[PDB]
Design a protein around this ligand. Structure first.
Ligand SMILES: [Zn+2]
Ligand SMILES: [Zn+2]
Length: 56
């Protein structure tokens, strides 16, 4: 994108239809890491795990 980085072409899991659990800001930076691990219980795509990672 113009101001967005969706490097999903190198993202095997995106082709599989994998969901992102990161916000725009974190996905553009850690897209590959943001697919790991997908939560198989409460799939909350609006909940950013990388933002929640910076708890301290
Ligand atoms: Zn991806
Ligand atoms: Zn985030």
């Amino acid at each position: 994108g113009a101001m967005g980085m969706r490097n999903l072409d190198e993202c095997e899991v995106c082709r599989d239809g994998g969901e992102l659990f990161c916000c725009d800001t974190c996905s553009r930076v850690f897209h590959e890491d943001c697919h790991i691990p997908p939560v198989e219980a409460e799939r909350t795509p609006w909940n950013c795990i990388f933002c929640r990672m910076k708890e301290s």
